[PDB]
Scaffold this active site. Sequence first.
Site, PDB file in Angstrom:
ATOM      1  N   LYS A  58       0.830  -1.204   0.000  1.00 37.82           N
ATOM      2  CA  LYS A  58       0.000   0.000   0.000  1.00 37.82           C
ATOM      3  C   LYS A  58       0.866   1.256   0.000  1.00 37.82           C
ATOM      4  O   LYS A  58       2.061   1.227   0.302  1.00 37.82           O
ATOM      5  CB  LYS A  58      -0.943   0.038   1.205  1.00 37.82           C
ATOM      6  CG  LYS A  58      -0.271   0.189   2.551  1.00 37.82           C
ATOM      7  CD  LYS A  58      -1.269   0.513   3.683  1.00 37.82           C
ATOM      8  CE  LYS A  58      -2.109   1.723   3.400  1.00 37.82           C
ATOM      9  NZ  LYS A  58      -1.269   2.911   3.671  1.00 37.82           N
ATOM     10  N   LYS A  96       4.295   8.459  -8.068  1.00 38.20           N
ATOM     11  CA  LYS A  96       5.036   9.381  -7.214  1.00 38.20           C
ATOM     12  C   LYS A  96       6.441   9.627  -7.765  1.00 38.20           C
ATOM     13  O   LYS A  96       6.986  10.727  -7.609  1.00 38.20           O
ATOM     14  CB  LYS A  96       5.064   8.831  -5.784  1.00 38.20           C
ATOM     15  CG  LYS A  96       5.593   9.782  -4.715  1.00 38.20           C
ATOM     16  CD  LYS A  96       5.037   9.393  -3.342  1.00 38.20           C
ATOM     17  CE  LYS A  96       5.557  10.305  -2.232  1.00 38.20           C
ATOM     18  NZ  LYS A  96       6.952   9.961  -1.807  1.00 38.20           N
ATOM     19  N   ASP A 102      -2.164  -0.111  -4.286  1.00 33.65           N
ATOM     20  CA  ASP A 102      -3.470   0.191  -3.699  1.00 33.65           C
ATOM     21  C   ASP A 102      -4.611  -0.242  -4.600  1.00 33.65           C
ATOM     22  O   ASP A 102      -5.734  -0.460  -4.126  1.00 33.65           O
ATOM     23  CB  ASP A 102      -3.578   1.687  -3.436  1.00 33.65           C
ATOM     24  CG  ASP A 102      -2.404   2.211  -2.668  1.00 33.65           C
ATOM     25  OD1 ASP A 102      -2.384   2.054  -1.432  1.00 33.65           O
ATOM     26  OD2 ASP A 102      -1.473   2.726  -3.318  1.00 33.65           O
ATOM     27  N   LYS A 135       7.714   0.937   0.447  1.00 37.12           N
ATOM     28  CA  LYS A 135       8.234   0.242  -0.734  1.00 37.12           C
ATOM     29  C   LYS A 135       9.548   0.843  -1.229  1.00 37.12           C
ATOM     30  O   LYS A 135      10.527   0.121  -1.450  1.00 37.12           O
ATOM     31  CB  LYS A 135       7.208   0.256  -1.866  1.00 37.12           C
ATOM     32  CG  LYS A 135       5.923  -0.511  -1.532  1.00 37.12           C
ATOM     33  CD  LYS A 135       4.960  -0.534  -2.716  1.00 37.12           C
ATOM     34  CE  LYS A 135       4.565   0.874  -3.128  1.00 37.12           C
ATOM     35  NZ  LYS A 135       3.813   1.612  -2.058  1.00 37.12           N
TER      36      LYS A 135
HETATM   37  N1  LIG Z   1      12.050   1.158   8.516  1.00 38.65           N
HETATM   38  C1  LIG Z   1      11.775   2.483   8.496  1.00 38.65           C
HETATM   39  N2  LIG Z   1      12.098   3.283   9.537  1.00 38.65           N
HETATM   40  C2  LIG Z   1      11.832   4.603   9.541  1.00 38.65           C
HETATM   41  N3  LIG Z   1      11.203   5.228   8.535  1.00 38.65           N
HETATM   42  C3  LIG Z   1      10.806   4.543   7.438  1.00 38.65           C
HETATM   43  C4  LIG Z   1      11.071   3.098   7.353  1.00 38.65           C
HETATM   44  N4  LIG Z   1      10.586   2.676   6.163  1.00 38.65           N
HETATM   45  C5  LIG Z   1      10.046   3.761   5.551  1.00 38.65           C
HETATM   46  N5  LIG Z   1      10.189   4.868   6.305  1.00 38.65           N
HETATM   47  C6  LIG Z   1       9.697   6.210   5.953  1.00 38.65           C
HETATM   48  O1  LIG Z   1       8.329   6.059   5.567  1.00 38.65           O
HETATM   49  C7  LIG Z   1       8.030   7.011   4.533  1.00 38.65           C
HETATM   50  C8  LIG Z   1       7.374   6.299   3.349  1.00 38.65           C
HETATM   51  O2  LIG Z   1       8.246   5.282   2.834  1.00 38.65           O
HETATM   52  P1  LIG Z   1       8.292   5.005   1.245  1.00 38.65           P
HETATM   53  O3  LIG Z   1       9.328   3.935   1.017  1.00 38.65           O
HETATM   54  O4  LIG Z   1       8.410   6.322   0.507  1.00 38.65           O
HETATM   55  O5  LIG Z   1       6.785   4.441   0.998  1.00 38.65           O
HETATM   56  P2  LIG Z   1       6.099   3.939  -0.380  1.00 38.65           P
HETATM   57  O6  LIG Z   1       7.200   3.889  -1.415  1.00 38.65           O
HETATM   58  O7  LIG Z   1       5.587   2.559  -0.017  1.00 38.65           O
HETATM   59  O8  LIG Z   1       5.008   4.939  -0.662  1.00 38.65           O
HETATM   60  C9  LIG Z   1       9.343   7.642   4.121  1.00 38.65           C
HETATM   61  O9  LIG Z   1       9.446   8.935   4.732  1.00 38.65           O
HETATM   62  C10 LIG Z   1      10.396   6.766   4.731  1.00 38.65           C
HETATM   63  O10 LIG Z   1      11.521   7.535   5.116  1.00 38.65           O
HETATM   64 MG   LIG Z   2       7.479   4.852  -3.263  1.00 41.91          MG
END
Ligand SMILES: Nc1ncnc2c1ncn2[C@@H]1O[C@H](COP(=O)(O)OP(=O)(O)O)[C@@H](O)[C@H]1O
Ligand SMILES: [Mg+2]
Lengths: 272, 272
Positions: free
Chosen positions: B10, B41, B129, B15
Amino acid sequence: AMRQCAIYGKGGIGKSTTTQNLVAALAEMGKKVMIVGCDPKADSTRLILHSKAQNTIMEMAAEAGTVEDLELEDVLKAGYGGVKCVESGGPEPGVGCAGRGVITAINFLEEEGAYEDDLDFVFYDVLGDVVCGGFAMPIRENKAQEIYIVCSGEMMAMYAANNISKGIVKYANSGSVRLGGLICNSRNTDREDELIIALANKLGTQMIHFVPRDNVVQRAEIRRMTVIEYDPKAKQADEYRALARKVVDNKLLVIPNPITMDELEELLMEFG
Amino acid sequence: AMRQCAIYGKGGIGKSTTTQNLVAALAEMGKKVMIVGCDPKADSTRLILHSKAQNTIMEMAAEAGTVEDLELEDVLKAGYGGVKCVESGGPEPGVGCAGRGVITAINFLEEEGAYEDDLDFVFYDVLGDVVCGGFAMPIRENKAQEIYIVCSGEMMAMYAANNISKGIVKYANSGSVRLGGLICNSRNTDREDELIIALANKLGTQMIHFVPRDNVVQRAEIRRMTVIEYDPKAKQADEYRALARKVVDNKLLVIPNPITMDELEELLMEFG
Ligand SMILES: Nc1ncnc2c1ncn2[C@@H]1O[C@H](COP(=O)(O)OP(=O)(O)O)[C@@H](O)[C@H]1O
Ligand SMILES: [Mg+2]
Ligand SMILES: Nc1ncnc2c1ncn2[C@@H]1O[C@H](COP(=O)(O)OP(=O)(O)O)[C@@H](O)[C@H]1O
Ligand SMILES: [Mg+2]
């Protein structure tokens, strides 16, 4: 007249919890409301109906043969406070377009006369992680004049709010779909209210309410109820009553000003 | 041979953070990797490239005239550890189908010979999603043989994992797309690892790694780096190294067994 309102936001941000509790508070106030679920998860009405979920228009039309063999009185169900409830549904994952059921549902409700003059509000609960297909249709086809976006200090939730705002701007030359406000559904972080107020000001709207994180929500939902019905004396019940009052009284509906990712990141950096 | 791997989950679950750090660890190990961003994104490569984001194939094809006027060497960019990076892009919100750029991108990479024999891994970072359009195409068209789903104890994240699993099952009669494991990206809640192990067992897969929540991630990303590059001695760097080792060594690839919402809710209720 009736006010046609849509609740958008990223997945899991609190759309269905906020919508059903907001609507319960409106019903408690004496308003007549219909909720139209526009999320394939299809559990946007369960707290009003005290149910597991609700069988969807897509599902029911398939069992009945065609959508023409469905009657509105077979599809719409009333729950807490007389609130009327319907779920669009959608195709199974990997099949078709996930938003196709929204188009079928809204057209069915329109033709079958669901928008009776006695309704005061209609709320669409819409998936907002992508703005396309049936999920864009409430904006593209002028079904939801007032968009409220549930978000939080989470960057992804704020990104989604900016994304949905770009879709509103895209259809500004037709119809009257406008951004009505941001609703902050708290993750219990400090200055979070200040952050979402700042985001709303940059977009040209307002933060209509800050909804606290409160465990009473889970205790109510385990029992398939809104907090309004489960514990009318709860502090959180009064929070949803405050949100409902401000939606009723809201007069600011704007074509928003989407921001760049630089200003998004500056916001997060600013408010720590 | 090369292993074609896709990371689903999600929005906002982790990711892109997990993928880029996993891939940095593989590069540190001596593997040759390409990351293909399949999320509108379009910031799935920024930590490898030390960049704001990356201009997308959709954007570049529009400036060049047609996708045929693009050369692979103009589109692919190399960053940390020689990891090669490309972003699909997609239409603006409210226009078209949000996943249309994924189809354009993967076809371009295939025809232009991006899948050179020297690559060891390709990772697609895919919005999960909804499972439709270009977001379903890595599954439908057999592009990602090994699916890893990032999730957490959040009900929405677990719902998404079950949803993506249904899409895998739907295309089981063709190609070889399989579920390789769940990756728990912690929200710092107790028994969370136990919960995601239990979910994986019900689906017929495994929890390949439990990634802790660690503030060093934010400190690295503020500086546009993976934790692997930012602080190779960090405990969290070793966590991503452990995840990468287990992905390399993983031999369990299954057609999953999606569960009902009753068993989902029982899981949450069980693990408190
Ligand atoms: N293990 C973790 N510890 C701390 N922050 C995290 C961790 N994994 C992700 N984040 C934070 O969560 C937010 C979303 O992560 P992201 O990888 O961009 O999500 P997605 O790609 O699934 O939309 C980012 O700000 C990232 O820095
Ligand atoms: Mg992403
Ligand atoms: N203010 C709140 N306090 C506590 N829990 C909340 C609150 N708002 C939402 N939740 C919980 O968050 C989860 C997701 O909310 P939901 O409304 O289903 O999200 P969406 O409809 O946006 O996917 C639910 O378990 C809900 O109980
Ligand atoms: Mg919902």
